[PDB]
Symmetry: D3
Subunit: 237 residues, 6 copies
């Protein structure tokens, strides 16, 4: 057991899906996993392990922010033998051509956090996803008739930033979505030699936004999880 995960080696699959909202974890276990069993409850961060098409898979939330998700991904990798981490969340878009409910894959993750500089002697570390995981997600989405956009994400430390001009800079450089964990997970994966990928759905447009229905949201959410799970099987082949 670790400080935040009361479990033992073997309890988690070597692949873990991680949503931000802790509540989505049991939903994924009930909706997509077979023979699921609870493997964690510390701090209410519910963890599960079951199978998908025979493949062993685990799901557990990471909390909002780089610091929070850095704790969980690190422990999973160093103490539970986890080899692949797939974050499945949501993000806000700054590009006009990026629409609500679009599925985005973060091959890279920009950030305003200082965690990677602290790791990389104050130089620029390109926090990137595992290439094969990226291509797997892309191929899985096409199979499900969904066109995923691949590019850069931006991991913000402040959901409510004091300076809104940064959003224009993000748009100018092609940022596909604004979220809060990707850069942290990518840093952890590199530090402890594991693989990671972040998949997000556009939940809002940080500017001229619109609206979606609850039915629309679950459909998109279930689409993202399907893509993630099928990408794992592709990776296995």
């Amino acid at each position: 057991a670790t400080p935040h995960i009361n479990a033992e080696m073997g309890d988690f699959a070597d692949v873990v899906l991680m949503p931000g909202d802790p509540l989505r974890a049991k939903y994924i276990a009930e909706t997509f996993l077979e023979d699921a069993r609870e493997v964690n409850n510390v701090r209410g961060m519910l963890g599960f392990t079951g199978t998908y098409k025979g493949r062993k898979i685990s799901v557990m939330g990471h909390g909002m922010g780089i610091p929070s998700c850095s704790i969980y991904t690190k422990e999973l990798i160093t103490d539970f033998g986890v080899k692949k981490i797939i974050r499945v969340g949501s993000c806000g878009a700054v590009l006009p051509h990026v629409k609500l409910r679009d599925v985005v894959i973060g091959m890279g993750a920009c950030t305003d956090s200082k965690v990677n500089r602290i790791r990389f002697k104050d130089h620029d570390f390109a926090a990137i996803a595992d290439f094969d995981m990226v291509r797997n997600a892309v191929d899985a989405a096409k199979a499900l008739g969904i066109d995923a956009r691949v590019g850069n994400l931006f991991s913000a430390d402040l959901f409510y930033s004091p300076d809104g001009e940064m959003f224009d800079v993000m748009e100018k450089y092609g940022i596909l979505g604004v979220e809060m964990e990707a850069a942290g997970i990518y840093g952890v994966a590199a530090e402890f030699g594991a693989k990671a990928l972040t998949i997000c759905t556009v939940s809002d447009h940080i500017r001229t936004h619109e609206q979606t229905t609850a039915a629309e949201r679950q459909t998109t959410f279930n689409d993202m999880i399907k893509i993630a799970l099928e990408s794992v099987l592709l990776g296995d082949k």
Copy 2:
């Protein structure tokens, strides 16, 4: 309702106690509050509002890390009229004379995060607590026969830092405890003109540690909450 708090103005008291672990929120409501009612459940971050000696009080967790707690404290202050935020958590000590279970009050909070530099044009912002709240907590602790140590805390972005030499630097400068939110809350309070204070109990010694019993832990925890609640009443006088 805000993006992370599904409630309306008036649902929260003007004073909110905030533990890290979301599970501690309902414990405080059941153990210390009268006529408590649920006011939030978004993302499982349970919020409550009741009274203590007739005083209206709310309790809700903030999650681990500066980014997470920055979201909640900001929304509470700008949308629910909250005026005082008291974080009640735990920390690790680097000073030999600081013992397990000691109660520490963070008048100031050092950090390796970039949030305040982003706010203060890349200069040094002294993230500090409200002075009166500090003195109230100190006076409340003495009344309960507890001697609280007042000083600097250090808010780490990485619970598992790559460089352990920073701990010697922290010890050398008198850091009383290592936690992960204080500097963020202090920054938020200053940005939106509210008051904040962080009270922590030493749960471990980042070096030569020992052990505590579960009974010892709850006693200390209940002591900290008592100090926090009584400090509020003192502040009211």
Copy 3:
């Protein structure tokens, strides 16, 4: 003696008051101390020692700026056994709700200097005063019928800043006054294990360039000094 102080162990009290102006120190010794004697004059930085209500006390100027005052405070602490340092100076107001002849107590000090980053491995070090000294001053002021403000000061390296944008920034985050050394003094206090406190009277206000000595300004300056002297008495108890 030291390279900047031509005196010997014993010549100073374990408590030292420090104005920036060497002439202000002579004025203070002359006005409030009994049996005063000059104990230093190197570079014209007059230091005196005498007693206040039978309590042995010293007063010495520290020049302008962090580089200057950090040299003197460091030497007093490591070579003359000084335990407490109380800077008594003036500051410029940035907040509109703060007017001239107002006593400010610096519980914390922000800065644009790099000295504390050089000390704290490029991270954010919260330069704070000693809690007890702050409380003693608050209580002494109250006993004198004075309502002092306790908050953040801003220590600038450039009295003549090349960019006035920072004043709006300071005001936004509640800085009470702008001076030039509190952050440096708090930094050496932490580095060499001593205690310090900065008390200031508002000399001028950026919110309308106005500052003109008078009987009431001089009355307020003397009140600050009485607060400093009376606060050490409370501490002795």
Copy 4:
């Protein structure tokens, strides 16, 4: 023409391969392109245009370092309508599991340069390649019986670094190769809306200073070029 390229719109193809050595560009045009013609010679930076399997293609050197290559790529994109840039060079290995005559594809590029921070408001910008170009190269290499590595490259400003500590840091975080311009090229691609990719063969290995041209090294260099050329063909489809 531009200040560094004495040619006209049309002289270059919408795809440009770029080695660092001007002489390597002449070698490439001569070896793989049909109907090749020199379209630039300013400052000796030879650029050529011809066709590969009937596909119009260009190849031009970009000199050493981010400052140099960023001038050329920028001019090609904004003044010659160039859409894709593929840097074909050499890199030094830092990982032991990576040996000479190894094809590396830079999905991302870390750097110690300040150019991207200057662009991204002092924050972390993840300098990444175009996903499609990466995939096309991976697939072309596979069709040639070559197993290319896809990961992070490190772009250094100093070929002769004043501190060898960074190599251990790079190795720790999995950097595949050390070169001098990939991060700069990815930055201009993002700034001016074009697509780029860096492919490298491992010239030497810091893990034992060894690098000696030979028939098998030259064979591997040609394979890289074939991968570059064949990858653009796949993209065209």
Copy 5:
């Protein structure tokens, strides 16, 4: 032979003139040197050695950018016994009172590059030329009746800067010319123990946008060269 220079100790003189353009080195060899032989052409970076007034002199291009010239100057200093390096390049003017074709002597060089911060523990290293060398150039210029301003140059990493506002900051602080190597050459001279000086010809104006043409280039460029060669002779005496 070094990694980028195919020559042997003795092929270069103890003094070397360096324009960024290889073709300009060739022109200097043919127009000012007697019995000039080619001693290097790796990567097309032409180097020559001959005599001037019976004095052995070398001339070799160094390419564009700090990373490029850092390589060449380092190899010359450590493997070919070169003691003095004189950069003879072009630059852009920011000040209105600096006309095209004017000669500037870089006593100092500001920069936006990080190379010197990496050498100087992230502090401010004033990249300055060798005093005697500067003095020789000023006298040599007077002896030729040519005008030459002595001051600061600014070595930029991006010829196409995304921040035009900085040109206002340069102008404000009296920057004479904008080029791309000086600060790097001075850093190398200091790191490896040699002496350097940069002389520049204002080839354009950042503001007005005038680009060198006519026969103004020849005479003006030949004036820069006459100063360099002659300043060397004065140095010998």
Copy 6:
């Protein structure tokens, strides 16, 4: 009259010598100036005006540290018509081949202060002296038979640095003397449009730990002064 100088336009000459020590200014006035009158003593910062070889000259202390001298040099330049400022101070040696009492001419000044970064958009501003002024000082010195090295000085913010390793970095890069004002005076001269030069007397050795005494101080300090005063006369001719 300015905030820190109680004088009127005309009381100071267009040239001003400035030691950090006020008492040393007094000594210069009495020992080298004819008909020397006191024109300021605010905060004890003694200023004097008299003649040397019939030339009107002023001399005033500036205190220790960049923040202190920045105030005085600025006020002199903008409110008293001062055109040239010559700092005549002491410094510590880092190089073994620099003996006590040696004279150093600061052509450039490195620093660990942030003042120039604040002026230069966080980039590298090479703080350099005025060429002519440096040249005048070198000739004046030769005319007196006194030795004087011309080079870089390092302006430190902390006389008691917590980082001794940096002394190795200074030595490595040829730093001639460690003092505390040069880089600030040069920044001010450039910001407000005046000319400056810093001449120093090696009063100690960071390494060996020797402190100025005997009659070595007098003659050596008088040699520094003779150079400054005389360099001025050469400047006039």
